[PDB]
Every structure is written in structure tokens, then in C-alpha cells.
Amino acid sequence: CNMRTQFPDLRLIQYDCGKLQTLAVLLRQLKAEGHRVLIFTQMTRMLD
DNA sequence: ACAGGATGTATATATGTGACACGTGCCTGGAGACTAGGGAGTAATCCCCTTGGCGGTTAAAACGCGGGGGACAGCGCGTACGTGCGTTTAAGCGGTGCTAGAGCTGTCTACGACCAATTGAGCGGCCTCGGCACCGGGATTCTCCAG
């Protein structure tokens, strides 16, 4: 099955998107400090 | 699971009350030469309305879910409508036998169109109050269980 058709991963949604990559790094670094975060974005379906 | 007993077709035939054929005539297309007016072919103006869609919030759909009271099936019975039979009513299918009134023809005005003016409705274009529209009471009115 794997060797005949390749489907998009769908699991790690940070794959294509460098915005989410740097956000993952940033949130991971902030987690040690644990002081909590507001993440603002317009585009209601980007919050998804 | 039959058979009298009816009713319904199917096939054939013929001559006479309607379908076709043929000649005529004569009103009506067809053909032709002018004269607009009408409509087409562009060229300008003014609108509205889609642009692509997004993410907030709302009303309207849409869905769950009980349950109740109507949609049907069952059963019955009790008229009432068809079925058939005898009568008789009166319509049909031909006739005779007037004259009322279509249908037409002609004649001739009153009537319609044109026809250039003329003007006075009328329609558009803003303005400005009343009049519905929605609201917020409280008081009569229904609807639903409850005895």
C-alpha cells in the first residue's frame, strides 16, 4: 500500500508551514517558563 | 369444475346516402411603378450590480422525540341501485305546406379619417405633514388539565 500511493501526512500539521515551525519552537521555549500565551489570528478557519 | 344462457365478435354482402371527379366562370392574387415611414446600424449617456469573501452574530431551518388521535383495516347490516319484465309513451323517420326573414343589391348621406394649428391636461420633480407601523400595557378570551 505504501509503495504504490503516497498520501499527505495530516498528522503533524506543522509540516509545510514554517510559521507553525517557529511557533512550535517559541511555545516550547516558553513552556519552561509556563507563563501562558494568547495567540491572536483572524481567519476563523485558521484557528482550526 | 362445469354448462345452460347471454352477450360480443368476426366476416360476408349490397345499394344508396354521402365522397370524388370535371367544367366553368370572375373575384383575387399576382405583377409592376412610386413614395414614405419604419426600422436597422452605430454612437452616446446613466445607471445599478456584481465584484470575492470574510468573520461576527442572528433568526430560520433542521433534527430529536414523545405521544396522541386520526388514518385504515375489519365487521356488519341495511338500504338501494342495477337487473330484468311488461307496458305505453311519445320520439323518429317521412311527408306536406305556408311565409318569416336571411341574404343580397343598390344608393346615398352621415360618418370617419385626415390635418394643421392650439392649448391645457398631465406627468415628472421636489417638499412636508399625517398616517400607518411597531410597542408596551393591561384587561378580556381560549385551551388544557382536574375533579
Swiss-Prot record:
In terms of superkingdom, the source organism counts as Eukaryota
User: Which disease does its entry mention?
Assistant: Floating-Harbor syndrome: A rare genetic disorder characterized by proportionate short stature, delayed bone age, delayed speech development, and typical facial features. The face is triangular with deep-set eyes, long eyelashes, bulbous nose, wide columella, short philtrum, and thin lips. Developmental delay, hypotonia, musculoskeletal defects, and behavioral abnormalities: An autosomal dominant disorder characterized by developmental delay, speech delay, mild to severe intellectual disability, hypotonia, musculoskeletal features, and behavioral abnormalities including autistic features. Skeletal anomalies include joint hypermobility, chronic musculoskeletal pain, scoliosis, and pectus defects. Affected individuals also have non-specific and variable dysmorphic facial features.
Task: Please report the name of this protein according to its UniProt entry.
Answer: Helicase SRCAP
The entry's localization annotation reads: Nucleus
What is its quaternary makeup? Interacts with CREBBP and EP300. May be part of a complex containing SRCAP, CREBBP, CARM1 and GRIP1. Component of the chromatin-remodeling SRCAP complex composed of at least SRCAP, DMAP1, RUVBL1, RUVBL2, ACTL6A, YEATS4, VPS72, ACTR6 and ZNHIT1. Component of a NuA4-related complex which contains EP400, TRRAP/PAF400, SRCAP, BRD8/SMAP, EPC1, DMAP1/DNMAP1, RUVBL1/TIP49, RUVBL2, actin, ACTL6A/BAF53A, VPS72 and YEATS4/GAS41.
- Residue ranges annotated as transmembrane are none
What role does it play?
A: Catalytic component of the SRCAP complex which mediates the ATP-dependent exchange of histone H2AZ/H2B dimers for nucleosomal H2A/H2B, leading to transcriptional regulation of selected genes by chromatin remodeling. Acts as a coactivator for CREB-mediated transcription, steroid receptor-mediated transcription, and Notch-mediated transcription.
Which gene is the coding source of this polypeptide chain? SRCAP
Q: Which family does it belong to?
A: Belongs to the SNF2/RAD54 helicase family. SWR1 subfamily.
